[PDB]
Subunit: 101 residues, 2 copies
Amino acid sequence: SPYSAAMAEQRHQEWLRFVDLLKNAYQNDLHLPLLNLMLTPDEREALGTRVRIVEELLRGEMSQRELKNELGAGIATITRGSNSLKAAPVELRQWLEEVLL
Amino acid sequence: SAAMAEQRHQEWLRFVDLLKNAYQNDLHLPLLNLMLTPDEREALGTRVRIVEELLRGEMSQRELKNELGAGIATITRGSNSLKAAPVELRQWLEEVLL
């Protein structure tokens, strides 16, 4: 069939298993070495940069040019980061505005 | 540049701190949806199984490719990362994943 809900739930349960693994690593102070095992150095740098992208999209002061030349974020990335922010639950957006700004 | 190096490090730690706080506030699921693409999340769920089967040591390289779609470079990245990990992590992962 064209869409498999069974495989979607199996993928979801594999993802939850990672989420739970990392939850427990934070509890036991093994989060930093776990993250180094599970993410490449480039993936880690990308995540650090994405935090600044979300912060700037939320602040809404940086120009497209400044976003591109300070964070490598082109019109594709900005759009994707915007759609993600639009899709996020308000409780997350509010919490992020508090914490990040 | 040790300055830039230290800048990139603080940016990474800020993410680690942000996610730690999201877990404390039960916002981790939506935070991770915002910060990772669907393909990145799938890759992470598959990487947990790769790590589990590497540690179990039962599946051959061929079987890892067959079952998990993990090719030689991916398996080698997993093996290299287990060798680079602190022993306490390896020992914990054996407890929790097996």
